[PDB]
Amino acid sequence: MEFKVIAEYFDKLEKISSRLQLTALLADLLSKSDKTIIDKVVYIIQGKLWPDFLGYPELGIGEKFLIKAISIATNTDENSVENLYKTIGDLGEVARRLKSKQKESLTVDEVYSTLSKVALTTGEGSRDLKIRLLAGLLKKADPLEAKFLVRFVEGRLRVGIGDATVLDAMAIAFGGGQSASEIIERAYNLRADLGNIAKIIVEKGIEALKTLKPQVGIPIRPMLAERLSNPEEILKKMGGNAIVDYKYDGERAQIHKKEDKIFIFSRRLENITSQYPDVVDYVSKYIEGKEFIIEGEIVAIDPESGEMRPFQELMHRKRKSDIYEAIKEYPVNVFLFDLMYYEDVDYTTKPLEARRKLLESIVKPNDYVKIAHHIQANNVEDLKSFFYRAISEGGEGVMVKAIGKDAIYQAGARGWLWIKLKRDYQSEMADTVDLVVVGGFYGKGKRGGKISSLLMAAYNPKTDSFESVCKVASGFSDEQLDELQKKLMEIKRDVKHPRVNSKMEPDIWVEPVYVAEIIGSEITISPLHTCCQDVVEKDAGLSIRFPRFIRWRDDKSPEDATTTDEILEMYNKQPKK
Ligand SMILES: Nc1ncnc2c1ncn2[C@@H]1O[C@H](COP(=O)(O)OP(=O)(O)OP(=O)(O)O)[C@@H](O)[C@H]1O
Known part of the structure; x- marks a missing residue:
């Protein structure tokens, strides 16, 4: 198989606009490819030599070093090679133009062979080997071949086709038509290596793919x-x-x-x-x-x-x-x-x-x-x-x-x-506040030894008081559930603190000291709580619906809590109905 055909593929790809024509172009190219080396073909037609997962180096050479490689392959001092590049703006074209002014044609094998060495050779003295190996290729290459060998090594094989494009074309070329897409896709999904799949499609046939399993390392x-x-x-x-x-x-x-x-x-x-x-x-x-x-x-x-x-x-x-x-x-x-x-x-x-x-x-x-x-x-x-x-x-x-x-x-x-x-969940029922713990409730039944419920309150700057908004039961990790007892007991008081007011009587009253981040759904009216007393509805205060304990706030003092005015401004902006 001769590289000529691949050069034709790239050149025409530059000209065409139809997805239809693209499919035809690849499917043709593929079917007229050599079954022996389809696994190389499938990556070259992309502008690669191997899939990304292998981790081999990207083919690359310095621009200054391509100019010498072309200069050698054409017998032209780098000086005048430099100039055409200034005027034109594509080294491939420059290379193509210098060849057409002046006995076996190139094979895909010798290209893949050579271009691998160029990609693979590094360390002391590789520069000179790359230059000489490329020059060799370009010299052996015909006009159009050269142009596209350059673009290939330069990275500048734009192209914009990928694995998916190729699978579609392999269905067309080897599966006998579009319906074969499902199988090829299925296999590729389990073994993301186009060349390996291509090889199976060609050697063992399309039917083989149906029972394909993953392969460790791919x-x-x-x-x-x-x-x-x-x-x-x-x-x-x-x-x-x-x-x-x-x-x-x-x-x-x-x-x-x-x-x-x-x-x-x-x-x-x-x-x-x-x-x-x-x-x-x-x-x-x-x-x-x-x-x-x-x-x-x-x-x-x-x-x-x-x-x-x-x-x-x-x-x-x-x-x-x-x-x-x-x-x-x-x-x-x-x-x-x-x-x-x-x-x-x-x-x-x-x-x-x-x-x-x-x-x-x-x-x-x-x-x-x-x-x-x-x-x-x-x-x-x-x-x-x-x-x-x-x-x-x-x-x-x-x-x-x-x-x-x-x-x-x-x-x-x-x-x-x-x-x-x-x-x-931001775009759902959510509003987040900072409340002060004013007391606690003991649990219920077989695990009701613990304090497992906290009376949370909000700050009222006008009255320097704390007014309850919600009783909180959920959000605590078992661990935090226990750290609570000793944390709360340490500040237990026999009667409600004069700066907290709540119509709700928890099992123990506590000093207003700790701040917890609470999240709820909406703010609702409640006869049981005192925050924003009588402002929206008489004989009732504001409340946090479906509250969930989130965090603690060591960086927040009790006076630094969410205010009753803030709870009101939050309430007042909820839809009316
Ligand atoms: N416990 C987990 N189980 C499964 N996937 C997880 C887990 N933790 C993280 N991920 C993964 O991390 C990625 C999530 O990233 P992100 O939420 O930004 O999605 P994305 O990058 O927008 O889209 P994609 O899901 O394609 O990555 C996904 O690949 C997802 O599968």
Whole structure:
């Protein structure tokens, strides 16, 4: 097979405007390709030599060094080669024009062979080898061939076709028409390597693809989540039943291991292994298993506290020269959330529970690789509780995931099996306030030993008083639920403090001291509470509906709380009906 045809492809691609003609052009090119080397063809027609995930270098040479390469291939001093480039504005064209002014033609094999060396050769003395190898190619090349060999090496193969475009064309060229798209797509999704799929399509035929499994070391197109803002709507989609994860803020890492070598692929299936040698160490030390494909989120962590840091910090890491310094300043934890392949077995077809049960049991307990924080939500309340616990930890929200026989790994597609629940609750019933704890209630029944309920109040600057707005029961982690007793008991008083007024009698009265961030749905009228007494309706005060404890405020004094006037301004701006 001769490179001539590929040069024709690129040249005509520059001329045509019809998606139809494009499909015809590629399908033709492909079918008239050589079955032996389709796996190279499929990337060259894009302007690459290999897929991104391999992690090989981008083909590149200095512009000053191309000018010498052309000058050599044409017998023309770099001086006059420089000038045509000034006037014209494309080195390929310049190269083409210099050839047509003056016995075996080029083969695709020798191009791919040569261009690999050029990409692959680095270190002392490579400059000169690149220059001489290119010159060789260009010399052997005919006019049009040259022009496009230049653009190719320059990166400037614009083109704008990608894997998807090629699959579509392979259906047309090899599957015998459009209907064959589904299968090719399916396979590619499980094995995101155009050349490998192409090779199978050609050698074993289109039918082979139907039973194709993933291959450790070649990435799976990631599964993607839908988005809804309503938690009730979400669980209805899940059959009232879901696994709910914290939505982590970090690098979406797909981790492969085969016998001993480890591979980390990015959200976009870039090879990011050499950026995370600590994750490599972590994986081999703490994840039991011969060979597998798993995925999780890599997350910047705080040296001390180990609070999570936002994604932007990992980005900063990527720009550090001393990797050992990079890791000191930007350590990392890995939160795993799925498992697609374990020891020669494809797990993509098995329920989420299954994949997770396995996933968990292979993680040796350590401080660096952990399972995503999660619960099984059996009602909306569970989902809501956890979601607010998530945003509470500065989180962006949660990933709600279906369970059962349908709950498979939908490689490369966006669908309703995973659904994100994000801060977007902003566009829903939400209003956030800072209230002062004025007292507490004991629980009820078999676990009613604890104080599990707080009387929250708002500040009234005119009267220097605190006026109750809501009784709060939910939002506390069990841990925080207990820190409460000793925290509250320490400031217990036998009678209501003179600066707090509430028509509600809690079990214990307390000193107005602690501030908590409360979130609710709307502000409603209530005979039970005193805040904004009689201002909107007589014999009743304002109240926070469906309040949820979120945080504590050590940086807020009681007088720094949300005011009664603020509660009114908030009320007064809600729709009338
Ligand atoms: N527990 C988790 N389970 C599944 N995916 C998670 C989890 N935590 C984070 N992610 C992933 O992180 C990414 C979420 O990023 P974000 O919310 O910005 O979506 P996006 O970048 O707008 O779109 P995309 O979902 O295509 O990334 C998704 O790839 C999502 O699958």
